[PDB]
């Protein structure tokens with residue numbers, strides 16, 4: 235029941251500073267422009283200890299499955315090959331991605347009827363807000 239309030243189908247409804255986040259991560263111009271248009275649907279499910287997060291959009295479809303605290307390989311939507319670990323901290327899903335001596339942290343939390351995603355790379359934060367689909 236660890237992630238019950240996250241489970242479901244969610245649709246992106248707002249974004250702030252995502253272009254700048256992507257710049258900080260090292261994403262190139264064309265990918266930033268196209269990816270920045272996307273309004274993904276995020277599908278979160280749990281089966282035993284395994285959490286699956288799918289993202290479906292016009293730009294790319296991604297899927298990760300993981301156990302909390304157990305590192306895994308991830309290919310991001312911008313084609314980074316990262317090592318990821320996702321944990322729960324006080325009801326917030328905390329996702330750290332490491333690649334090329336770089337790191338980014340993505341936090342997902344339930345706030346009212348929304349799922350709020352905060353993405354941080356160095357001093358740059360982006361906020362992505364999802365509603366139930």
Ligand SMILES: CO[C@@H](C(=O)O)c1cccc(OCc2ccccc2Cl)c1OCc1ccccc1Cl
Nearest residue numbers: 256259269272289291293294296311312340351353
């Ligand atoms: C599933 O993770 C979602 C979420 O929780 O909002 C999420 C959290 C943090 C960064 C994300 O994309 C980083 C990216 C995406 C595209 C280009 C450059 C970068 Cl740097 C992201 O996926 C967003 C995406 C996922 C799949 C398909 C399209 C999109 Cl636009």
